[PDB]
Scaffold this motif. Structure first.
Motif, short mmCIF file in Angstrom:
data_model
loop_
_atom_site.label_atom_id
_atom_site.label_comp_id
_atom_site.label_asym_id
_atom_site.label_seq_id
_atom_site.Cartn_x
_atom_site.Cartn_y
_atom_site.Cartn_z
N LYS B 33 1.07 -1.15 0.48
CA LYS B 33 -0.11 0.23 -0.02
C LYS B 33 1.11 1.17 0.15
CE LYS B 33 -3.71 2.47 2.20
NZ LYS B 33 -3.30 3.70 2.65
N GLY B 34 1.13 1.91 -0.94
CA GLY B 34 1.34 3.25 -1.52
C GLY B 34 1.47 4.31 -2.05
N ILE B 35 1.08 5.42 -2.37
CA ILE B 35 0.50 5.83 -4.18
C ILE B 35 0.80 5.70 -4.95
CG2 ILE B 35 2.00 8.24 -3.30
CD1 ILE B 35 -2.20 7.87 -4.57
N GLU B 36 2.40 5.11 -4.94
CA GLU B 36 2.91 4.93 -6.83
C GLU B 36 2.71 3.30 -6.43
OE1 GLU B 36 4.12 6.44 -8.52
OE2 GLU B 36 6.37 5.24 -9.36
N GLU B 37 2.67 2.75 -5.50
CA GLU B 37 2.67 0.86 -5.25
C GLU B 37 1.51 0.75 -5.65
OE1 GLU B 37 4.47 3.28 -2.44
OE2 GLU B 37 5.33 2.59 -1.06
N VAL B 38 0.50 1.36 -5.29
CA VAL B 38 -1.12 2.01 -5.57
C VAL B 38 -1.11 1.68 -7.17
CG1 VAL B 38 -3.24 2.02 -5.39
CG2 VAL B 38 -2.06 1.66 -3.61
N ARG B 39 -0.17 3.03 -7.64
CA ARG B 39 -0.59 2.84 -9.04
C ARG B 39 0.16 1.77 -9.88
NH1 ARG B 39 -0.12 7.62 -9.96
NH2 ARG B 39 -2.04 7.82 -8.47
N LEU B 40 1.34 1.29 -9.35
CA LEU B 40 1.58 0.47 -10.18
C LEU B 40 1.26 -1.27 -9.67
CD1 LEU B 40 5.87 0.85 -9.51
CD2 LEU B 40 3.76 1.98 -10.89
N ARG B 41 0.88 -1.10 -8.68
CA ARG B 41 -0.04 -2.44 -8.74
C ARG B 41 -1.39 -2.85 -9.75
NH1 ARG B 41 0.06 -7.19 -9.95
NH2 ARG B 41 -1.65 -7.78 -9.12
N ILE B 42 -1.84 -1.37 -9.58
CA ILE B 42 -3.44 -1.48 -10.39
C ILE B 42 -2.90 -1.21 -12.15
CG2 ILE B 42 -4.81 0.52 -11.35
CD1 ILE B 42 -5.34 1.37 -8.41
N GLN B 43 -2.01 -0.89 -12.42
CA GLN B 43 -1.66 -1.01 -13.71
C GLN B 43 -0.94 -2.39 -13.86
OE1 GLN B 43 2.47 -1.65 -13.19
NE2 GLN B 43 1.83 -2.82 -14.87
N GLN B 44 -0.46 -3.06 -13.12
CA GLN B 44 0.06 -4.33 -13.24
C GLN B 44 -1.16 -5.69 -13.19
OE1 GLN B 44 2.31 -5.55 -10.20
NE2 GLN B 44 4.07 -4.21 -10.77
N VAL B 45 -2.48 -4.69 -12.50
CA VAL B 45 -3.84 -5.62 -12.21
C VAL B 45 -4.44 -5.64 -13.56
CG1 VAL B 45 -6.12 -6.06 -11.02
CG2 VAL B 45 -4.29 -6.05 -9.50
N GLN B 46 -4.91 -3.94 -14.26
CA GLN B 46 -5.15 -4.11 -15.34
C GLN B 46 -4.71 -4.40 -16.85
OE1 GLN B 46 -4.70 -0.17 -15.26
NE2 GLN B 46 -6.25 0.39 -14.41
N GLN B 47 -3.27 -4.67 -16.68
CA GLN B 47 -2.43 -5.94 -17.58
C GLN B 47 -2.90 -7.09 -17.32
OE1 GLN B 47 -1.54 -5.00 -20.17
NE2 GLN B 47 -0.53 -6.89 -20.29
N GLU B 48 -3.20 -7.53 -16.22
CA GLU B 48 -3.61 -9.56 -15.93
C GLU B 48 -4.82 -9.82 -16.92
OE1 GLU B 48 -2.12 -9.61 -11.79
OE2 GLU B 48 -0.68 -8.63 -12.15
N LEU B 49 -5.45 -9.09 -16.00
CA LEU B 49 -7.81 -8.30 -16.34
C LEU B 49 -7.28 -8.58 -18.43
CD1 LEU B 49 -9.92 -9.10 -15.96
CD2 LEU B 49 -10.31 -5.89 -15.60
#
Lengths: 49, 49
Positions: B33-49
């Protein structure tokens, strides 16, 4: 034709299994998107139990 | 009856795998959890989806 039928049976079975694998991954990805979206802290602490 | 029971048991197993994966996701989000980390993980989840 018996050999080809066996091949097609196996292929259809494996394709359905992979379809279910993709469905699982897709659902978990949507769930993780939800948890990354809103109410992160309390949801994270509450859900694990 | 045996086929029905096995189908139900496999459904339960699939749900169990899903819940295990969601526990893993909760742990990962807790760690990340962290603004940069959250952004990166959201991007990763979008790519996986």
């Amino acid at each position: 034709l018996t050999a080809q039928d066996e091949e097609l049976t196996q292929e259809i079975k494996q394709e359905e299994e992979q379809k279910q694998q993709f469905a699982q991954q897709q659902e978990i990805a949507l769930e993780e998107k939800k948890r990354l979206e809103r109410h992160e802290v309390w949801n994270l602490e509450e859900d694990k139990r | 009856e045996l086929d029905d029971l096995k189908g139900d048991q496999n459904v339960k197993e699939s749900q169990l795998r899903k819940e295990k994966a969601e526990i893993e996701s909760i742990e990962q989000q807790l760690k990340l959890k962290g603004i940069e980390e959250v952004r990166l993980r959201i991007q990763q989840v979008q790519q996986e989806l």
